[PDB]
Amino acid sequence: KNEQELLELDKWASLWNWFDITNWLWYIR
């Protein structure tokens, strides 16, 4: 594949990383 597809995925994964970490910190705290 084109390597730059990883940067496009990075944009989507980074938003869900932020969602997942904040919801996680709220559940465990």
Partner: antibody, heavy 127, light 108 residues
Framework: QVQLVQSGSELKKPGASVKVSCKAS????????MNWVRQAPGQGLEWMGW????????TYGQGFTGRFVFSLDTSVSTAYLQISSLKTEDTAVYYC????????????????????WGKGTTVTVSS | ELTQDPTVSVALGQTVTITCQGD??????ASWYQQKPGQTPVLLIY???NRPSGIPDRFSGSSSENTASLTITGAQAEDEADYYC????????????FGGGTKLTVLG
């Protein structure tokens, strides 16, 4: 011979616009991202943003919105940086580099690196 | 990475560690670049500790907590230069930053 060749030095008046070029050689241009870096006099390196060389979509770094436009001419393996409404403080060396990305060990994460660099273009803005 | 010591000093043959500190370094690795006066930057270390083929074995990369480090083993005169770390910043959307840079002085 994998290399990036940048356009020559330039002088502009405040309020004008400038277009700097970055031509890739020795590899397939649209297979890798390109990024731009600014270095003002006596200062450090600053991330300006990157451009998808497969689609032409630009992603501007924080602080480089509005007056900065990334574009490409894939038919000649060249990426462009246009700065509009130039200010004296835009005086700097502008680098293009190949922006590489690879998957990290942790899912959803990546690492990045700039493996090939152009020699820089000096842009001076003065009255 | 975000913050980086402005100046650092070494002695020929000794080892020195240049360190960048930033919250994003807890999740993303850093790459490290050398820039000598008037020269274009050169990639030294990527993905925390991988070395391009042209780079001498003196240069090593590491990471710990919110910090990433470049270490030089056999410090020589040719290593007197500026060193910059690069990684993601703290923005939710993908954005990148250079550290402020470290001037290395090799004494003796």
């Amino acid at each position: 011979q994998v290399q990036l060749v940048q356009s020559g030095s330039e002088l502009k008046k405040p309020g004008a616009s400038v277009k700097v070029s970055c031509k890739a050689s020795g590899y397939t241009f649209n297979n890798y991202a390109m990024n731009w870096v600014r270095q003002a006099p006596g200062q450090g390196l600053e991330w300006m943003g990157w451009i998808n060389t497969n689609t032409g979509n630009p992603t501007y770094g924080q602080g480089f919105t509005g007056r900065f436009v990334f574009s490409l001419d894939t038919s000649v393996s060249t990426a462009y940086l246009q700065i509009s409404s130039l200010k004296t403080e835009d005086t700097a060396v502008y680098y293009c580099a190949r922006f590489r990305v690879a998957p990290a060990a942790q899912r959803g994460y990546f690492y990045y690196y700039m493996d090939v660099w152009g020699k820089g273009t000096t842009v001076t803005v003065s009255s | 990475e975000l913050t980086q010591d402005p100046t650092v000093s070494v002695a020929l043959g000794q080892t020195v560690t240049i360190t960048c500190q930033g919250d994003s370094l807890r999740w993303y690795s850093a790459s490290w670049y050398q820039q000598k006066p008037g020269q274009t930057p050169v990639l030294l270390i990527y993905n925390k500790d991988n070395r391009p083929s042209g780079i001498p074995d003196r240069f090593s990369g590491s990471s710990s907590e919110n910090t990433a480090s470049l270490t030089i083993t056999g410090a020589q005169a040719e290593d007197e230069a500026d060193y910059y770390c690069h990684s993601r910043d703290n923005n939710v959307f993908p954005n990148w930053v250079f550290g402020g840079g470290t001037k290395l002085t090799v004494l003796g």
